[PDB]
Amino acid sequence: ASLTEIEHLVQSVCKSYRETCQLRLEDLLRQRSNIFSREEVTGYQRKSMWEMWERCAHHLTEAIQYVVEFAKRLSGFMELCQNDQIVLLKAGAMEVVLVRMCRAYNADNRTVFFEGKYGGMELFRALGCSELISSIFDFSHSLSALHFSEDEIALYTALVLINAHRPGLQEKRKVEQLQYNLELAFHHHLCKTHRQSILAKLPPKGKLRSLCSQHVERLQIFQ
């Protein structure tokens, strides 16, 4: 409830993000001028569907591990029972990784950083999931227009994970209290930075979960 407590939560959220964000934003930004040549692009397109899914499933799985570390460094999260930790991470972790991808997305030319250089959608053609790739590019383009800071990303992804509506929770009221305090931390932070305007602009509920197709499920077969 307290203002000092709310400030402590904000620093808690931002600290854990800063240590689990995986790639440094200043490196991502420095590399925007480094674009795959047409020859390097064609090299990705000549991958087999399986080879290209093995590569992307490696990335997705790596990124989930970091989101799991992110959650476990939040003080309120380890207080929850382990069942509820599982239910939240299972239902929310892939959605956080998708949000985290907006940092690798350069809205200026509609390219994404991938394995060392920026490339267009055509780079993922060998997945055979054009619709999906397109939908992900359009979602990142939406988030990039908000000019999220690292702190704002940290707080937003916290609210993706800490959702009292996930079915299967056995201490619903605990996660509700946590969700409410995180909403207060988010709103408080945005007021102190005069950035409350973004709340109206956030992607609507459901559209982010709409991203997660079965294309990105059952990835164990890829090793």
Ligand SMILES: CN(C)c1nc2ccc([C@](O)(c3ccncc3)c3cncn3C)cc2c(Cl)c1-c1ccccc1
């Ligand atoms: C837009 N889509 C097609 C994607 N973009 C991605 C952009 C970046 C990454 C990174 O993994 C990453 C992850 C987290 N934070 C920073 C970088 C990455 C790139 N270079 C080194 N890394 C670690 C992975 C992406 C993936 Cl897997 C997909 C994707 C691939 C297949 C299906 C769906 C999405």
